[PDB]
Write a protein that binds this ligand. Sequence first.
Ligand SMILES: *[C@@H]1O[C@H](CO)[C@@H](O)[C@H](O)[C@H]1NC(C)=O
Lengths: 193, 234, 234, 216, 216
Amino acid sequence: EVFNATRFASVYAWNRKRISNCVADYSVLYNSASFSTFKCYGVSPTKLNDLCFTNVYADSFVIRGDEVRQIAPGQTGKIADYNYKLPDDFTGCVIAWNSNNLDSKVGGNYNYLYRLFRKSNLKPFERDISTEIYQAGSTPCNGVEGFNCYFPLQSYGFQPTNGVGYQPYRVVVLSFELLHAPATVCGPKKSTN
Amino acid sequence: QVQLVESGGGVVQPGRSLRLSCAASGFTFRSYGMHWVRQAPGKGLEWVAFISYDGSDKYYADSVKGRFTISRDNSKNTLYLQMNSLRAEDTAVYYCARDLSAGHCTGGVCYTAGGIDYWGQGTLVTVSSASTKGPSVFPLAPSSKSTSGGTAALGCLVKDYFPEPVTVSWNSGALTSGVHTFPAVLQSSGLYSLSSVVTVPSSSLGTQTYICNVNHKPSNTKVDKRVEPKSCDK
Amino acid sequence: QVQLVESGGGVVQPGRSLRLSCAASGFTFRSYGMHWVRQAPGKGLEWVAFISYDGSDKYYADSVKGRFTISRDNSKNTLYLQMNSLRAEDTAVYYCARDLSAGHCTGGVCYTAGGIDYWGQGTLVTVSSASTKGPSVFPLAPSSKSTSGGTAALGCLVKDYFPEPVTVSWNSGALTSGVHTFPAVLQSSGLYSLSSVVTVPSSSLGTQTYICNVNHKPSNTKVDKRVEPKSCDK
Amino acid sequence: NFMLTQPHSVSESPGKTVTISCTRNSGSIASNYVQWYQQRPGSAPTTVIYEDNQRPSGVPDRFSGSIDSSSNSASLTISGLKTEDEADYYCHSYDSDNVVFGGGTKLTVLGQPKAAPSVTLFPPSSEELQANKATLVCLISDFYPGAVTVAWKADSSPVKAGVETTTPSKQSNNKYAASSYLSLTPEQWKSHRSYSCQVTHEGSTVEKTVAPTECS
Amino acid sequence: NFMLTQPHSVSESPGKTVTISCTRNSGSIASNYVQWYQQRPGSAPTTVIYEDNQRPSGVPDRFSGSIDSSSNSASLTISGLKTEDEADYYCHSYDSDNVVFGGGTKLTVLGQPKAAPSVTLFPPSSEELQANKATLVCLISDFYPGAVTVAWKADSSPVKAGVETTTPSKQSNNKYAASSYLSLTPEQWKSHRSYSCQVTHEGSTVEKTVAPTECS
Ligand SMILES: *[C@@H]1O[C@H](CO)[C@@H](O)[C@H](O)[C@H]1NC(C)=O
């Protein structure tokens, strides 16, 4: 329902998916040769099947391939500061793969929007969707677009002719919440005849 | 910011045992897989080993297979390498490193890989026949041919020392424009030498005061000979 | 003789915990009642708390209710403080203190607490983000015009040092005449700069050996700076 | 939650008798248990008075204590003033809420003739400018009495940020020396055409102004 | 286990692009882990590319990696080089037993004119000769390109024992310099009539002579 979802969300408005009261098998996730790279930071990508969790927060957004490294702790950038942030103690995995076959148009796919101008970096797991005009000068423009006022939102052009280093990609990030409650998200335990 | 500090290398006798460490600062050390890599002077990178984030999985090199020991401890936020049986080739600075990815995969092959973007300060192991011998430092006076608005190179010369490193800063760091410390030179006698001068106009002849600074720390010898162009007296 | 020794307080990261101390002699420690008092620089004195002789009762001020703990070891004859969850306003010279006796009172209505008869030597605590920085000194060469029957001005500049204590002396403290150390002052960068000069004869210039002793023990720094006639040539 | 009110300073000839004010905005300090201490500048405060007419060791007989219930106050009487004891005194007791402190009042006894203030301006040192450092220092010394107020200005505009003035301290000639430090930056230090280090001392002010271009 | 091969020196003007044949001659290197590091001489190596075309922070965008799928090799493309890019490039990776490093590179940026090598020697002094120890000193300076070769000969016979050529060093005048020493016993110093410090500068031999008349 998440990776094969019908609709996608913008990076500046990254949707949050809540996972609870279900059994998830990650063998198909990391055993598939159709996923570009699944960046796993915090515990393990493989020997984690002996660890349970209460709730899992799932987020997904479309970014360019040049920004793959930006989705990580201790990173700075457009998305890494003004749109998303990961703490240095983050637990979870990040997955990205090619999206040219689904999110590219000859005339350019401009449906995806991202924040470009911001006064300060965001907190971890903090989503900013404000459309307030950014003032880059000392003299205020009284909320009027002009020399000292620029739109904080920006879009990227996706075309089939774009190179492998410039094709669009879809990035999915997963995080785990471990409160003082019994676990609700479990993995398939070993079964034998 | 995230940074790593390594210390402990230096003058060590062959065939003995030693202990090394990697200090960490900035990130959750226990959430990452540590590194051990050495870089020999005059050579390139020489990877040693690797270790899982929790210490269960360990990966090693063939050349010194079993010859070292690799370890980490989560609570003290430190990384260790119980290296043993030093030889001639292993003269190399040791660089502790952070993993760019933990256990990433292509899709079918899943192993704890090694990716480095942030490195450590560096600790160098010194295993050699020549001992930690003290140097004799010479002053380099400018020849008289550099006058009348020209540039007269001048400074001091250090030759026949051991081991590395040595730092030269003009006027004890008060002068930085023109400092050109030549790389150290390992001579056939097993000793070291290099050059370091500054570029100043010849209008300072007889008025500027030169004091050449030599900081050969692992042997801790300093020389302050009064620096001047040698007089033209027969 | 009654006197209270002070040591222990100093630099600490906000949000940490530190164990202060105070020790005295020449009296009966198990019987008397002490006190704690800090002192925010440039502001009035402040009450802290009181502990009785038997180590049973314990009253506290409003600010550190629960956040601070205090106890004494009568066998070890020393009093221990424990401050936790440091805030920015905590930086203040602390002062262990004393009551007239154990808690006594009169009038029927009364309570086991009295006055402050002695105090301590003082302890400075530094709760902040800036970390250790070694002192930097320069030879303040006096003006050459101070000749033929006058008094000259010279000294050593202790700038960009952190933290206290830094002791300024001349002839390693032997020549006490004329030395006047100006108070330490913070800068907008969070660092410290102060002045310290000695009133000396102008005729003594270039004759007597000038050395200013600057000792900064917490960083293990001792700098010897010499004053020499200034070379204002062409 | 309480406070004791006393002035900032008291100045009087040595041959007179002066007192101090210790009273509260509320509560009741009558029939209670009171002390009084003194802080000579820059060192450890020392006990002076506790529980009225008591005296410690090593103090001359010039001090006297009393308590009053009409205005809820207590008085420390000092006769035959000398100049050796110029300092600040405060107030303490166990009141209805907590042990409480007092503000402080400077003691001044005119023992030496007055003199005009002396002001000198010290720009940052020559080697300091290349290091992008700046610390403006103004010297205020050999002024009597020791009460001095210093304010920083830049091109006639008053300066408030980075202001730090040291409390005057007794000198060998019984005078006082104080220093005022302004924490600027070389980019901001060099911009202003002129400055001023005002010294307001008993109504007498002498201003000295220099140019930052003298550093080069 | 495995081995990568790198051209130890490649020269190209900054206006064009350079390529490296990261050829691991054994097995295969398809669908495995990829690394790349660049080293300024005398300093720690800096990562270039990991896993095909992924670049670190602060590196110029000009660099770009590639892999030859058919030939089982890799390559790095940097468009519009700079003289600042003169360094050592290395090819690391990991087959799933161990990590392998390549032969290394010496990329030369042909943006400056070549320099004519002029050499001057430094004979040993008399005072040190009393201990039967003396080292022959050769100084090479102001040569371009930095790819240099130094050989030592004795009476037209090539010398290998005690021969050590040091790393060419970046100079203030944008040229290169180095030195070579040879510690030999005075018996070898006395017996041989003369020696030579043969230096090859891109096919041009530069050499200077020293004599015993200055040794006594
Ligand atoms: C999406 O659907 C296809 C078709 O059944 C399936 O092969 C693929 O595994 C699905 N995606 C994921 C992430 O499982």
